[PDB]
Symmetry: C2
Subunit: 352 residues, 2 copies
């Protein structure tokens, strides 16, 4: 039985006593105990496949900072990895693919993985984490969006210019669509399995959508995330399960996204909170906005950025505080704790 | 004596018969003859220091596509290289620095290079190119903005998260300012020397400004580019010399930039041309907007993107067509030629 409501209420723009908080990549190297467990797993790849350890790292943050929500520890490339492509995580270079989807054949041959079957290990963690959280807080299930995933699947990893997907997009659009569509069906099944296995909320990372035109962003990215939402079950375990979409950088596309069906939209320090709320506030809840590097600042300074960001939004009800990007390994542990306390202490005035 | 006016007129929002065109990084590997001359120089570093060869590559594009303007071949890291920091161009990794500016000492010890003296080689190319262009087209002089330069000088090269400058920014702002200010003085001297040595126009690349807050973007980036403009000589050789500022991604900051003093603002496919013009059009001229990857498309398709982009703007007078980012080596030569002809042929209707 769940005790903390905040997160779930805020995403639904429902009154809360204080604003909720959670940090992207709260299960990361900035935590000494995290770096340890990761060494028990061997490589990141296996860490993400081990249910006991995957959970443990998801729990480490909650034992330091009373965060209103936890996000299963997994990888965005979970689905593409289960599509027979040769994916490895070089602790130096980066996520790489030996057989990147090139043309149409590559796409038609691409298979839809059974979440419970081939991706049944991320489902295991969900089950574990839920039983572990012992009702203390809601569990967030996640996945990349059809497009940013197709990026790595075509680029073969992380590209600095995405020179390939676009050569495809602008010269073989039917192919990119064949692909993106399959990826839509896939992740929809993928996300529902999480929801069924315990996920009480869910979020889609379209981390690269902002590298596109407003035309192409909508053609090849929004449409597909939208489909997921039209096909996700908004309810389970007697509760409405929330959905948050997040295109880093796409602060201007903010208007179209709201038409998505989705309950919440994520933001990054590139978009003004007030601005965003003034443009979609009464339509969708908003998630975080701070700059992760700000966590390097002295406690006092950080606190005033929580206060700054809390204003610009403030007055209402639909807000979940958060960073615009995951935490960087070098950030000090008690510095995040300062941040997590600033949002609670200083946001309570905007709910009275 | 100059014959082509287009570029210079358009930036000044003055009537032209057709819209002008020029591509960022038109002196690049996509040109077979470019890859050759680069091999004559040895490494990129020396290619940028050799006046004869630097010019030659700047001229290669004009012998294939009748572009309304040419940009001296040089590097943004010209100034930081002349500041005693240890900079090398690894054809694999990237621009690296052995002694990155770390704290205040690093900044106070940092020297202002005499353009004609220590950077007198980029001035040589200017003189050469101008005499080479034999009046056919105006020469653009360029440099990075104080901030994006301070990026490489602090990060030591290209960072994917700029994790360091920001740790500085948010924890040692006086230091980052000490730095940025010096960099402002520097580049101002740097750019004037180009203007004096033949540059008929000039442009500042703040390629990383968009990775910042709107608050910080203005504090640590705009202010400093602005200073340059307040200190650049808008006239020389009987002509008003134009100034173009360009923050890739900062399409939303578009309003503040116009208050800069600058004549033209650059854009990337992330910002809608029509939108931009509707927001600053009657205040500043705009430069390009297309996606470089679009050049992979079939001629017919490219042409319609020139036509699309020409609309959204169209009707007026203050526009210079361009890409939102340099050309990628793999783009076919006659494909750019198609693009360069589409802007001339199809833009002439918007000036009648």
């Amino acid at each position: 039985e769940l005790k903390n409501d905040r997160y779930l209420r805020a995403l639904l723009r429902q009154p809360v006593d204080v604003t909720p908080v959670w940090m992207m990549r709260q299960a990361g190297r900035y935590l000494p105990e995290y770096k340890a467990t990761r060494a028990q797993a061997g490589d990141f790849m296996s860490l993400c496949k081990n249910a006991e350890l995957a959970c443990e790292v998801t729990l480490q943050p909650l034992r330091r900072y009373p965060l209103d929500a936890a996000i299963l520890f997994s990888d965005i490339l979970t689905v593409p990895d289960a599509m027979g492509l040769g994916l490895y995580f070089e602790a130096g270079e980066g996520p790489r693919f030996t057989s990147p989807v090139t043309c149409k054949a590559d796409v038609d041959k691409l298979p839809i993985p059974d979440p419970e079957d081939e991706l049944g290990y991320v489902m295991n963690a969900v089950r574990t984490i839920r039983h572990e959280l012992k009702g203390e807080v809601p569990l967030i299930g996640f996945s990349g969006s059809p497009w940013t995933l197709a990026t790595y699947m075509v680029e073969g990893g992380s590209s600095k210019a995405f020179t390939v997907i676009k050569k495809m997009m602008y010269a073989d659009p039917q192919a990119l669509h064949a692909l993106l569509d399959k990826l839509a069906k896939s992740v929809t099944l993928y996300l529902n399995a999480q929801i069924k296995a315990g996920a009480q909320a869910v979020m889609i990372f379209d981390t690269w959508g902002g590298v596109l035109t407003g035309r192409d962003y909508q053609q090849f990215s929004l449409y597909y995330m939208h489909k997921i939402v039209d096909g996700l079950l908004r309810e389970n375990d007697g509760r409405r399960v929330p959905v948050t979409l997040f295109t880093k950088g796409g602060g201007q596309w903010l208007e179209a996204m709201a038409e998505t069906g989705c309950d919440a939209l994520g933001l990054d320090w590139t978009t003004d909170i007030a601005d965003a709320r003034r443009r979609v506030g009464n339509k969708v809840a908003l998630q975080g906005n701070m700059d992760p590097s700000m966590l390097y600042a002295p406690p006092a300074r950080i606190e005033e950025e929580v206060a700054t960001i809390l204003a610009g939004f403030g007055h209402g009800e639909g807000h979940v505080f958060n960073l615009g990007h995951g935490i960087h390994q070098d950030v000090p542990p008690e510095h995040a704790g300062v941040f997590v306390e600033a949002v609670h202490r200083l946001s309570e005035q905007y709910h009275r």
